[PDB]
Amino acid sequence: TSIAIGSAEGFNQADKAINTAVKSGRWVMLKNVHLAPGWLMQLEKKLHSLQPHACFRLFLTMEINPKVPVNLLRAGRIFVFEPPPGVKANMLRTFSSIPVSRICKSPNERARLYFLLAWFHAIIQERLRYAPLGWSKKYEFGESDLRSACDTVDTWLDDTAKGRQNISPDKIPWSALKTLMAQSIYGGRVDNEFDQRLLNTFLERLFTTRSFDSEFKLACKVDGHKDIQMPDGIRREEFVQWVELLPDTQTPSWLGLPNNAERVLLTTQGVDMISKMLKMQ
Amino acid sequence: KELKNIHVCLGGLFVPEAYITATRQYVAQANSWSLEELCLEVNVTTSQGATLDACSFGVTGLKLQGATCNNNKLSLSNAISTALPLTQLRWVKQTNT
Amino acid sequence: DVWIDVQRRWVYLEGIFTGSADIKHLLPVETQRFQSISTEFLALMKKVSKSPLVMDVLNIQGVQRSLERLADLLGKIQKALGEYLERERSSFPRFYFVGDEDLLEIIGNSKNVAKLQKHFKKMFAGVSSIILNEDNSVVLGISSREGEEVMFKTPVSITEHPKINEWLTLVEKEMRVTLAKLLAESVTEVEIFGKATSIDPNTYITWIDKYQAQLVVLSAQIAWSENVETALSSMGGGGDAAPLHSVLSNVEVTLNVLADSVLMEQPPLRRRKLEHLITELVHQRDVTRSLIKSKIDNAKSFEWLSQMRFYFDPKQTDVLQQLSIQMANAKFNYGFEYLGVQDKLVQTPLTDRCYLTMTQALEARLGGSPFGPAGTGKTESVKALGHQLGRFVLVFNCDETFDFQAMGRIFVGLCQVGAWGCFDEFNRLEERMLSAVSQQVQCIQEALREHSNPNYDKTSAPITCELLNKQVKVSPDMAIFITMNPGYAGRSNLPDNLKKLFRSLAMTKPDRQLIAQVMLYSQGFRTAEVLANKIVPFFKLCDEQLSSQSHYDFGLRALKSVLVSAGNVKRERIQKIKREKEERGEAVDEGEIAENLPEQEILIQSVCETMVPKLVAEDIPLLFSLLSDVFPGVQYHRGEMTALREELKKVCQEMYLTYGDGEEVGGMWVEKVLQLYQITQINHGLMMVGPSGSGKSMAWRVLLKALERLEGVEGVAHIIDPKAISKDHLYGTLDPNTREWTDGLFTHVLRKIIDSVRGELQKRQWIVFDGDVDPEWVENLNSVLDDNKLLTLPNGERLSLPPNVRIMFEVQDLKYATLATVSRCGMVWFSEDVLSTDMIFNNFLARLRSIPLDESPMLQIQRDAATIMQPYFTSNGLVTKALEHAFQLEHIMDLTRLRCLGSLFSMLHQACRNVAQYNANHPDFPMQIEQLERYIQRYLVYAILWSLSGDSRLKMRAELGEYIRRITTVPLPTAPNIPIIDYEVSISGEWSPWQAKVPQIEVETHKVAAPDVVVPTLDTVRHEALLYTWLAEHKPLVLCGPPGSGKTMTLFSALRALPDMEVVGLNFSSATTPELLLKTFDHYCEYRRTPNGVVLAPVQLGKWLVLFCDEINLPDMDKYGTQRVISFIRQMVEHGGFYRTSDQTWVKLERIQFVGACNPPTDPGRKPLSHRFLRHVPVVYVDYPGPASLTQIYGTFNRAMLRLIPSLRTYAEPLTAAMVEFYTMSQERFTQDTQPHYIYSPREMTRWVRGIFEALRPLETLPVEGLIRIWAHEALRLFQDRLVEDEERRWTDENIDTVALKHFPNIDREKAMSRPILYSNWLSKDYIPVDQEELRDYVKARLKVFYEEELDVPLVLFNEVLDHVLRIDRIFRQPQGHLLLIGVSGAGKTTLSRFVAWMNGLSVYQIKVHRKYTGEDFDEDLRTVLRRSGCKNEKIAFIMDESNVLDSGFLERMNTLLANGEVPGLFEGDEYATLMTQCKEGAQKEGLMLDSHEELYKWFTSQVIRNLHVVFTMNPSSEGLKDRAATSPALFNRCVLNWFGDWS
Ligand SMILES: Nc1ncnc2c1ncn2[C@@H]1O[C@H](COP(=O)(O)OP(=O)(O)OP(=O)(O)O)[C@@H](O)[C@H]1O
Ligand SMILES: Nc1ncnc2c1ncn2[C@@H]1O[C@H](COP(=O)(O)OP(=O)(O)O)[C@@H](O)[C@H]1O
Ligand SMILES: Nc1ncnc2c1ncn2[C@@H]1O[C@H](COP(=O)(O)OP(=O)(O)O)[C@@H](O)[C@H]1O
Ligand SMILES: Nc1ncnc2c1ncn2[C@@H]1O[C@H](COP(=O)(O)OP(=O)(O)O)[C@@H](O)[C@H]1O
Ligand SMILES: [Mg+2]
Ligand SMILES: [Mg+2]
Structure with a gap:
C-alpha cells in the first residue's frame, strides 16, 4: 500500500494501512514524509512500541533535508539514492533495472540498441557533475527519461520489425529514435540552444548504422591515444560482461569533455575529505 | 567621435548587451542602413597591432574556454582559458549565404 | 444542540x-x-x-x-x-461541472428551458445556447457565443424524452453526430477544391460560409494530409518525378485566394474563418516545402510521421470514430466537441515540438508539463492541441487553496466527462498538496494504462479509479496538463514522484518572427515578411537597450498586443479612407486602398499606442531612435482626440484640476490620460505605475467621467485595497467541512456584475486594485488577465470576464510582482514630473476659492486669502523654492512633496478659519484687507516652516528658517539670533514670540509629576498649537520621536483644548492586524444603513473619535514589504471608508479620525512607513527635552515637591541639577546598542520626582542628608535595576556618588550614602529607610508565616533576596504597576513574587497551561482575572512566565491589557452583557450609580488598572529580549524591568 504524505486524509490512510499491515504482514510505503516533520515523530513512537508481523515492512521515501527527526533516522536503516559514481556504475545500474526478458526479444539488434541507450544515459548523467561545462544547468536527466527512451525504442523497433529475428542496421528507424530523444524524451528538459546542440551532437554520434560496425568507437582519445571500443556482441549478457571489464580509470575525456574539467573538483573534494577527517577527530 | 575608438571591457560594463546594441546602432546610422539587417563578425588581433575601421569596435577581457585563437582560427587546447588580446566586432550587411 | x-x-x-x-x-x-x-x-x-x-x-x-x-x-x-444527485451525475457526466444548487436548479426547471440557457457555457466547450422552436419542445440545434450555430440533423424532442438527463444526453450525442456529418460533407467539397489547378474564389467563399470555423480548418487539414499521403504513396518507387510539387502548388494557389479574400471587407465570422485557414495553409506550405527539400519519397519516413496527419475513413459505420489524428506513433480519435470560434495559434517549430511531446505523453497515458518563462505559449499551446483533437479543455488557475479535496473533485469531473484539465500555475500549490495530488494523478494514469490494454473489452466491467474514497469511471479521453513558470516567486517545488508522472517540455524561446509574419499575413498586410523581420528584432533590441524596469515587458504578449492593435488600426484606417472617398467623389477600389497603404506607419502607430505609455523618461528617446533606425524614413504623429479632449476639459474644470495641451501646464498629465484611454481600448487588464502622488487616481477618475459624458455609458468604479484584507476575504473561502463556498470581495463584485440584475452589463465597470501587488494574491487573476478572461475558483466554479469590465491596478511600484503579472497587463507609467507642483497649487487655490470650509462670508474670506497667497504659489515662487530646499534637509521620515503640501494646505485652511473666528468675535469691526494680508503672509511663512521641517530636528528647522529669510520678502521677526520657528502669528497680523505663551507656573504640591500635568515649554506650546491646527481639520497626523519624548503627553494636552473629541488608545505591535481596529470600531462605534450606504459612526453623537495608535510602525511587513494595518488605515483615510467582509459592503467612516505615534524608523523593530500612507499624514518630530527645558520642567516639579518641607526649600535648584546631570550621563553611558532595554527618557525623571514625592509626603521634616539618600535610592531603583553587567552597576553607584557630591558639597557622605541603601514601609507606617538586619529578621518571620499559610518551600535569605522583595513591594504599591523579572530559571522570581503579593494582600493568579491550551483558554482566563479585579475590586497579581506563551495572540492580548487596562474585543456577546451586569453590581457596591454602558466600562477599566498587577518572568536571552521588544512593546515601556540574572 503506497500513500503520499501531505494531507489529513493521507495521515489517516497511513495510520490505517500500518495498523492493518502490522497484523496481516503486508508492506506499507509512505512517500514524501519529509513534508510532515512533526508527524514523523509520532510515527517513530508508534513504531517503537510495536511487534508487527514477520513479513511486515515499512518504507519511508524522503528527500535529504534537516527537518527529518534525528530519532526517526536512528530508528531505521538509511539508504541514500543519488547518481551513480561513474559511467560503469551507471550502466550497470541501468542494465540491472531493465528486465532481462525485455532486452532479449524477437530482434537481436534490440540488445545493442539498449546498450547504446545505456551508454548515452550514462554519458549525459555523468556530464551533469561538471555543471558549467558538461551542460549549462543542472538538468534533471533521470530514470524516467531512461524508461521513456526504452519504451520508444521498443515501440519503434517492434513497428519496424514485425517479429523478424534479425533486421539490417540500416533498416532500424534511427531518425525516429534520434528525433524523439532530442525533442521529447531528453530534449524536453533542455531549455538552451547550445545544450540542445550538445544533445543533438551525442544522439547523432551514437545512434546510427555505424554503431553496428566492429570498428565503432564509443569515445575517442580518452587518455593518450587509446579509445573506448564498441563491443562486438549481440546478446545482453555479452554487453553486461563488457561493462564489467571497464578499466575503472574514468576521466572526463570519456564524456567528451577535456581531462582538466575535474582538476578543480577533484581538488576541492580532496580538501573537503581532509576537513571531514579533521571534523571527526 | 572619440568614444568610438576606445576599447571597453564587456565584463566591466553594467549592461554589455546595451553596448552591443549601441555599436550596432552607430554602424547602422553611419551607413544609413536598416538596423535589423546587420550581423556581427569577430576578428581577434593584438591590442597594439590593430586598426578599427568605420564598423569595427574594440573589446578587451574576453576569455576563450578550452580553445586557443591563432590567426583568427580556433584550435582545441588543454588550458582552462586563453586570454584574447583584442576582439574587433564589425557590423556588416546580412548576406543570407 | x-x-x-x-x-x-x-x-x-x-x-x-x-x-x-x-x-x-x-x-x-x-x-x-x-x-x-x-x-x-x-x-x-x-x-x-x-x-x-x-x-x-x-x-x-x-x-x-x-x-x-x-x-x-x-x-x-x-x-x-x-x-x-450522485446517481443523476453518473448519467450525463457533464453535470459534474455544475454545483449542487445549480444541478437542483436544472432538475426542478426541466419544464421551462429558458432558465437552462445559462448553464450550457459551463457544461460545453463552445455551446453557449440551445436553439429551440416556438413550442420550446424540440431542440433544433446549438449556438455559440459568437453566434455561429450548428443545426442538428435530427432534432431532439423534449416531449418524447421528458427526463432532463435523457434529452441532454441526446442533445450532446446529436451535437457530435451532426458535427461528424457536416465534417464529412465539408471534406467531400474540399476534396473537389483540392487536386485542382485553379480555385474559383466565389465557390471557396461559399464553402467557407457554409461550414463552421472548426470544420473548414479540419477539412482543409484532412484534404492536405490525404494529398500528401497519395503523393508519397506514388513516389514510394524511389527516384521518380515528384507530384508533391503539385500539392505544394495547390497550397500556394489556395493561399493566394485566401490572401486576396482578406484584403477586401468581409463579415467578421468569415474573416476569422479566413484567418484560421490562412494560418493552417501557411503551416501546410511550410511542411510541404520541408518534405520537398528533404526529398522524402516514402510515406513511412519519420519526416512525415513526425507531422500531424489526418485520416478520414467514410467506410466506418461510427461517424465519431470516422476521423483519426496521428502524430508519430500516437493516434487519437476526434472528440467532436463543439468549440465555437476559437483563436487559432500559429504552428511554429516550438508549437510542433510541443504537439509532438504532448502527444507522446498522451500515448504513454501520462500527463504533459510545459514549463518556461511567462508568455512562451505554454497554456495556449495546450489548449490549441486540445482543440485540434476536438477535446473539451478546461483551464484551472491554481493556487494554494487548491487542496486535496478540490483537486480530487476536479479530477472526478474530468474522469467522468472525459475532458482535458490544463492546470496553470500548478506550482502555486503547497508542496504537501502537490504530494497528495500525486497519488490521485498516479491512480488516474494507472486506470488509463489499464484501459489502453487490448485485453480489456468495452462490454466488460468499466475501468474505475479510487478518487476521494469512491469508484470513479475514467474516460479514455481524459488528459491532465500542468503549465508552470519555474523560478517565479510564490511557486513551490514539485516532488520527484509527481514529476515522474508528467513528460516535461521546455518552452522558453517562442518563434516570434514566424508568429508575427503569419499574423500580419492573415490580417491582409502586404509585405508581412519585412514587417515581421523589422518588428521582432525591434522588440529584441528594446529588451536589450532599454533600462531594466520592473514594469517593462517586451515578450510575446507585448508583440501579440502590438500585432492585434496593428490589425485594428489597419481596419480603422481603411474605414477612414472609405468614408473620405464616400464624402469626396464616388470611386472606391478596395484593392487600390490596400495597395497604397502605409503598413510600416500602421505598425509604428501600434507600437507607440502600446509600448510608449509604459516607458520612463530616459527610455523614450532610446525607443524612438530604435524606431527611426529599424523603420527609417517613416514617421507617425498621434491623432488629436479632440472629442475626448473637450470632455476632459469640462471634467477637469468641474473637478478643480489643471488641463493642458502639449507643452502647457498639465499637458503631460493629459497625455497620460489619453494613453490610459488607448490602453483601455486595447487591453482588458491595465496597470497605472508610478511614484506616490503622480496623478494616477485623478487620471483614471477623470477618464471615467469624460467617457461617461462622451459615450453616454455610465461608468462605475469598484476600488479595492487587496492587501488591506486577507486573501480569503478577497477571493473567497471553501469550507473544509461542508464544502460551502463563501465569496470574497472581488469575487462578489465580479459575480454581481455578471448577473447584472440592475443592468450592470450595460455600464462601464472598472475594478481598480489600489494597493500593493505581490504574487500571492495577483496571480489568482492570471487566467483573468489572459486570453481565458476567466476566474477559476477551487470549488470548480468559473466566471467569465464580461467585455465591459476592465481590471485595473493603481500601484507605486512593481518590485515584487513577477513577470507573469507584468506581461498580462498594459502599463501606463506616471512619473512625478507628470504632475507638476504648479498643478497642485492650482488645485488647492481652486478648491479654496470654490469650496467653503464651514460646509457666504466664509467663502469670501477664503477667496480673499487665496488672492493674497496667489503670488507665493507660482512657479519659482516662495513655496516652490522652500520645498526644493527642504528636500535637501534631513527628516525623521522620508520626505514626499504631497505630505508637506497637504500639511501646508491644512494649516492655511486653519488660518482662514482663524480669520472667520476673528470676524465672528468682532461683529462691529470685521478684519480689513490690510490686516488680513499681513496675517495671511506671516501665517503662510509659519505654515511653510512647520510643514516642510516639522519632521526634522532643531538644526534643520533653523536652516530652513534661515533659507526662507534669505529668499522671502514677507516681513519677518527682526531678532538677530532667535530663529523664525520660535514665533507665531497673532490674529492681529504681527509676529509674536512663543515665549509669551510659556509662563513660569507653580504646580500644586499634591499634583507633583502627575500623569496629566505638563510644565509649559517652547516645544510644548509650539507642538500643542501645531497639533490643534492639524486636529481641528480632522487631518490624520503622526508624531515621531524617541520613546518617552512626550508625544502622548503633547497629544493629550492638545486634545484637552478640543472638548468635542474623544480619544481611544490602540497599542500596535509586530502582529497587529486590522482586526484590532475592527474590534475598536465594534466597541466604540456603530454601523447604520443610511440611504447612501452603510455608515460607521461613533456611538456618542456630536463627538469625533480619535483613534490614537501608540506604535504605528511596529506591525510586521510581509515578505513583499507591506503592512496590512497600514494599508487598512491608508484606505480609511484616502477613500474615507473600508470594506465589511461579512457581506462585502462598503462602509463609510463618519466622525472618525486617526492619530499615530511612533519611534524613528531607524530604531530596531521599526519599519519605514509607506509613501502612499505618509502622503496623507503630516509628521511632527518631538525630540527629547534639552538640558534647559528639562531643568525648567523638573525644576518646577522639584520646587512643588520641596514645598512640603520648608527647611529643604532651598535645595530645589541643586537637586534638580543632580537629577538632570546623572540622567544625562546614564543616557550617554547606556544606549540601545548594548542592550535593547537600555532606554532612558524624561519618563525616568517623572518617576524619579514622583517617587521622591511619595517618600516625602508623610514626613513632617527631614535633613538634607535624608533627602539625598532618597534621591540616591530612587536613582538606584530607576537606572540600576535594569542593568545586566556588574561593571554597569558599579559605574552607576560610583557616578551617583560623584554627582551627589558635586551638587551637594557640604554634606555628610556616610550618613547619606551608606551603601546598603534600603527603603521599606514594612517595619513602620512610613516609607523610611530600613536596616538590613531588621529587614532580614522581619522577612524571616513573614516567611515562616508564609510557609505555614502558603507555599511551604524553604528559602535562604541573602542580601539580593531582600533587595528583590523590596523592589517587588515597591512595584505592587503603585497603580498599574507591572513587573518584568528577567533572570535564570530557578532563581526564585516566581516564589519571591508570590511571597511579596501575599505580604501585600494580592491574590496570586497563574494560568495553568497544558498541551491542549489554546487562545480561547487564555481569553477565558483573562476574562476571569478581569472580572475578579475590575468587578469584585480584588487586587490580583497575575504571574506569567515566558513558557506559558504558545502563540503571538498571548502577547497581543497581554500588550493591550498592560498598556490600556482593557482588551477591546475580550468581552463580546453574552459575555459583554454579563460583564456589564457585574460591573453595575460592583459600582452599586462601591456607591456609584452608573447607567450607560460607556461610563460603566470606563469604571471597569479604572478598576482593572488600579487592581491588576502583571508580573512577567523570562529567562535572559539575547535575541529573545530583542524579539519581545517588538512583539510586546508595553513589556518595555509599561513594565518595570528588574534584571535578577543568575545568583552572584
Ligand atoms: N490634473 C490635475 N491638476 C491639478 N491637480 C491635480 C491633477 N491631478 C491630480 N492632482 C492633484 O495632485 C495630487 C495627485 O493625487 P492622486 O491621487 O491623483 O495621485 P496618485 O499618483 O494616484 O497617488 P497615490 O500613488 O498616493 O495613490 C492630488 O492632490 C490631486 O488632487
Ligand atoms: N504560436 C503562437 N501563435 C499565436 N499566438 C501565440 C502563439 N504562442 C503564443 N501566442 C500568444 O501569446 C500569448 C501566450 O499566452 P500563454 O499561452 O498563456 O503563455 P504562457 O503559458 O507561456 O504563460 C497569448 O496571447 C497567445 O495567444
Ligand atoms: N513639559 C513637560 N511637563 C511634564 N512632563 C513632561 C514634560 N516634558 C516631558 N515630560 C515627561 O516626558 C514623558 C513623556 O511620556 P509620554 O507622553 O508617554 O511620551 P511618548 O509619547 O514620547 O512615549 C513623561 O514622563 C512626561 O511627564
Ligand atoms: N532563595 C532561595 N532559597 C532557597 N530555595 C529557593 C530560593 N529561591 C528559589 N528557591 C527554590 O526554587 C524553586 C522555585 O523556583 P521559582 O521561583 O519558580 O523559579 P524562577 O526564578 O524561574 O521563577 C523552589 O524549589 C524553591 O524552594
Ligand atoms: Mg499560462
Ligand atoms: Mg491614488
Missing part, C-alpha cells in the same frame, strides 16, 4: 423542495416523506409559538423524542438526496 441543526436542515430542504416544484416527479417517496416532515414542522410551529417561554415548552413531554426522530429523518432524507 439538536434544535438548531434540525431547524437549519428543514429550512434549506424546504427551500430546495419549494424552489423546485418539479422535483417531486423524480423524487416521489422522499417527497411524501418530506410532506410528512413539513406537517410535523407545522405542528411544532403551531404548538411552541403559542407559549413563548422556554420553561413552558421544556415541561411538555414528547418533544425531545420527536426532535430526535425528526433529526434522524432529516439526516436520512439528506443522504438520500445526495445519493440521488
